[PDB]
Design an enzyme around this catalytic site. Structure first.
Site, PDB file in Angstrom:
ATOM      1  N   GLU A  36       0.837  -1.179   0.000  1.00  0.00           N
ATOM      2  CA  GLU A  36       0.000   0.000   0.000  1.00  0.00           C
ATOM      3  C   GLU A  36       0.876   1.233   0.000  1.00  0.00           C
ATOM      4  O   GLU A  36       1.699   1.399   0.905  1.00  0.00           O
ATOM      5  CB  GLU A  36      -0.888   0.060   1.259  1.00  0.00           C
ATOM      6  CG  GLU A  36      -1.677   1.371   1.348  1.00  0.00           C
ATOM      7  CD  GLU A  36      -2.466   1.538   2.649  1.00  0.00           C
ATOM      8  OE1 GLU A  36      -1.904   1.301   3.745  1.00  0.00           O
ATOM      9  OE2 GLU A  36      -3.645   1.933   2.577  1.00  0.00           O
TER      10      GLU A  36
ATOM     11  N   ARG B 269       0.946   4.848   0.845  1.00  0.00           N
ATOM     12  CA  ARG B 269       0.219   5.917   1.517  1.00  0.00           C
ATOM     13  C   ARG B 269       0.768   7.226   0.944  1.00  0.00           C
ATOM     14  O   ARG B 269       1.694   7.808   1.487  1.00  0.00           O
ATOM     15  CB  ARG B 269       0.448   5.851   3.030  1.00  0.00           C
ATOM     16  CG  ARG B 269      -0.522   4.881   3.738  1.00  0.00           C
ATOM     17  CD  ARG B 269      -1.950   5.482   3.765  1.00  0.00           C
ATOM     18  NE  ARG B 269      -1.980   6.729   4.524  1.00  0.00           N
ATOM     19  CZ  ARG B 269      -1.985   6.788   5.853  1.00  0.00           C
ATOM     20  NH1 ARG B 269      -1.982   5.674   6.575  1.00  0.00           N
ATOM     21  NH2 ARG B 269      -1.946   7.951   6.461  1.00  0.00           N
TER      22      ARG B 269
ATOM     23  N   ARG C 176      -4.906   8.966   2.192  1.00  0.00           N
ATOM     24  CA  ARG C 176      -5.791   9.033   3.358  1.00  0.00           C
ATOM     25  C   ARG C 176      -6.158  10.471   3.662  1.00  0.00           C
ATOM     26  O   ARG C 176      -5.281  11.310   3.857  1.00  0.00           O
ATOM     27  CB  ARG C 176      -5.110   8.413   4.578  1.00  0.00           C
ATOM     28  CG  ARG C 176      -5.997   8.334   5.797  1.00  0.00           C
ATOM     29  CD  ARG C 176      -7.160   7.340   5.615  1.00  0.00           C
ATOM     30  NE  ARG C 176      -6.691   5.996   5.267  1.00  0.00           N
ATOM     31  CZ  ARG C 176      -5.942   5.226   6.064  1.00  0.00           C
ATOM     32  NH1 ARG C 176      -5.585   5.662   7.265  1.00  0.00           N
ATOM     33  NH2 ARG C 176      -5.522   4.025   5.649  1.00  0.00           N
TER      34      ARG C 176
ATOM     35  N   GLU D  69      -9.783  11.569   8.234  1.00  0.00           N
ATOM     36  CA  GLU D  69      -9.767  10.167   8.625  1.00  0.00           C
ATOM     37  C   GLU D  69      -8.363   9.667   9.021  1.00  0.00           C
ATOM     38  O   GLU D  69      -7.982   8.519   8.765  1.00  0.00           O
ATOM     39  CB  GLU D  69     -10.437   9.310   7.530  1.00  0.00           C
ATOM     40  CG  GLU D  69     -11.963   9.506   7.572  1.00  0.00           C
ATOM     41  CD  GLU D  69     -12.782   8.474   6.825  1.00  0.00           C
ATOM     42  OE1 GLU D  69     -12.351   7.302   6.705  1.00  0.00           O
ATOM     43  OE2 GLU D  69     -13.896   8.839   6.375  1.00  0.00           O
TER      44      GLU D  69
ATOM     45  N   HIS E 176     -12.713   5.000   8.473  1.00  0.00           N
ATOM     46  CA  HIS E 176     -11.912   4.827   9.680  1.00  0.00           C
ATOM     47  C   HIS E 176     -12.456   5.677  10.838  1.00  0.00           C
ATOM     48  O   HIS E 176     -12.760   6.857  10.655  1.00  0.00           O
ATOM     49  CB  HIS E 176     -10.463   5.238   9.406  1.00  0.00           C
ATOM     50  CG  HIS E 176      -9.941   4.755   8.089  1.00  0.00           C
ATOM     51  ND1 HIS E 176     -10.358   5.286   6.887  1.00  0.00           N
ATOM     52  CD2 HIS E 176      -9.078   3.756   7.783  1.00  0.00           C
ATOM     53  CE1 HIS E 176      -9.776   4.633   5.895  1.00  0.00           C
ATOM     54  NE2 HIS E 176      -8.996   3.699   6.411  1.00  0.00           N
TER      55      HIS E 176
ATOM     56  N   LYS F 101     -13.672  -1.500   3.457  1.00  0.00           N
ATOM     57  CA  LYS F 101     -12.703  -1.459   4.552  1.00  0.00           C
ATOM     58  C   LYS F 101     -13.222  -0.598   5.697  1.00  0.00           C
ATOM     59  O   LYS F 101     -13.670   0.515   5.459  1.00  0.00           O
ATOM     60  CB  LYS F 101     -11.380  -0.856   4.081  1.00  0.00           C
ATOM     61  CG  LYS F 101     -10.371  -0.679   5.240  1.00  0.00           C
ATOM     62  CD  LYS F 101      -9.098   0.092   4.819  1.00  0.00           C
ATOM     63  CE  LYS F 101      -8.153   0.239   6.023  1.00  0.00           C
ATOM     64  NZ  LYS F 101      -6.955   1.077   5.732  1.00  0.00           N
TER      65      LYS F 101
ATOM     66  N   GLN G  51      -0.271  -1.866  14.114  1.00  0.00           N
ATOM     67  CA  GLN G  51       0.263  -2.739  13.078  1.00  0.00           C
ATOM     68  C   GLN G  51       1.459  -3.494  13.651  1.00  0.00           C
ATOM     69  O   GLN G  51       2.306  -2.929  14.338  1.00  0.00           O
ATOM     70  CB  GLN G  51       0.651  -1.932  11.840  1.00  0.00           C
ATOM     71  CG  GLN G  51      -0.536  -1.197  11.198  1.00  0.00           C
ATOM     72  CD  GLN G  51      -0.127  -0.447   9.952  1.00  0.00           C
ATOM     73  OE1 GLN G  51       1.034  -0.057   9.813  1.00  0.00           O
ATOM     74  NE2 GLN G  51      -1.079  -0.219   9.047  1.00  0.00           N
TER      75      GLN G  51
END
Lengths: 257, 257
Positions: A50, A52, A86, A90, A147, A174, A239
């Site tokens: 991913e 970001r 993002r 969020e 989120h 998601k 994470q």
């Protein structure tokens, strides 16, 4: 047992199939940093990468973002790439572009052929129709996300978000929440379990922070097709390093059913 | 943030504290088999040892049992020993002596001072007082349990079982269920977490089978103070090798807090 009712095939890898998928973020500030970071993450063996892009300083320079995306494609090889900007509302980094400018950039990256999936936030609502049609023309998969960084909504609300996401045309829904008690962690798992039986698309769910660690390691047992793990740098609280996730997944799979 | 509201100290080990406890069963048809299993299981360093005396063919002989009891106590150093005679109606083996003899044997075994904990069925309602005082006299902890091998009852039933166990004087309340779906696994965790907030004593819960594996590795996050693993042989469906349980617990523990 498949994680999702109907698995999706992304560049020869399956999302929502029998096997959980691990995605590791890349958060560099510029081209050189994003590339070096991708190299490091890719040596670890994530199923998905991913990018970001909200951390990218030159995010308002279309040419640099494209050249970097092209560079990431060559480093990633067969590993699918998820492109995410993002939004600040969020939990993302503040960025110097509009809602409309973000859409123009996502389209330019989708049409580049460099990426495989794109994330677009559920809250932008109606503006999702255009992003959906356009991604389907570029053969790019669409992940529609939401989120909650302040806490954990009731199960009903989470189920609604995922139903919403699917109604909007998402290929993957998601939802991430921030737990304040073990009870919130169960709510996220229960919402995930219930949504898996009701929706026709794969789901990606996680409870952030320490309390939610178990959702990153075992959410797949309840329908979460992808878990986000650290391949070099972390993009969200809770994470866990890729290797530790792999160790636990191995044991969980051998002993689960 | 301790697993239970008030940890209990049993021969050098704390149950209900920060660390989840691992219990390993010893199943042996006869004195020799039993004593063999103990050496082996104890070589792995489990926190507790559960000898499932209902496997012992010569249970009709107190001198033999006491003899064995005294023997295993010798092999186990300070490792706490939980003496269990599982009913047949709750997954236990076939037993030649009836109710009274069991209680008489339990008393005889309690006064021998070879054991530290005793597991008794909540199903024996009023007859629990009998074992209750029998155990208190010898400074033996009382685990009151319930096992559902044919399915997973509703959360309310599980919560009621644990409340009653505490009502009957249990030092530890135990409930095990057989999940038939992921939803059942979450029901077991929800009941555990709800019970945790209602009872003053430690709780031991588990969903058996492959489906329930997650509960043996993460139940402690919802209030389950003890998890049963394989040290040599399996005494119930879904038990995982002690080494793999330790691996996951360590990872889960560093990352959950």
């Amino acid at each position: 047992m498949n994680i999702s009712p109907k698995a999706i095939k992304v560049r020869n890898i399956w999302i929502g199939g029998t096997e959980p998928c691990i995605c590791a973020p890349v958060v560099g500030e510029d081209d050189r940093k994003v590339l070096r970071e991708a190299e490091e993450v890719c040596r670890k063996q994530p199923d998905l990468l991913e990018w970001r892009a909200d951390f990218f300083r030159a995010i308002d320079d279309q040419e640099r973002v494209l050249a970097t995306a092209n560079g990431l494609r060559n480093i990633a090889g067969e590993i699918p790439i998820l492109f995410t900007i993002r939004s600040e509302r969020e939990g993302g980094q503040p960025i110097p572009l509009n809602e409309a400018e973000v859409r123009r950039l996502i389209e330019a990256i989708c049409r580049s052929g460099a990426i495989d999936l794109v994330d677009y936030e559920l809250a932008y609502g109606e503006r999702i129709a255009d992003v959906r049609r356009m991604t389907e023309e570029c053969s790019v998969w669409l992940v529609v996300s939401r989120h909650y960084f302040d806490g954990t909504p009731r199960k009903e609300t989470l189920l609604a978000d995922m139903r919403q996401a699917e109604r909007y045309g998402a290929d993957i829904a998601k939802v991430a929440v921030m737990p304040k008690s073990p009870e919130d962690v169960l709510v996220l798992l229960q919402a995930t379990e219930e949504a898996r039986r009701e929706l026709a698309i794969p789901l990606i769910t996680m409870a952030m922070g320490g309390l939610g660690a178990i959702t990153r390691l075992a959410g797949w047992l309840f329908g979460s097709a992808v878990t986000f793990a650290v391949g070099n740098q972390s993009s969200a609280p809770g994470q866990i390093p890729i290797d530790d996730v792999r160790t636990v997944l191995s044991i969980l799979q051998t002993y689960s059913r």
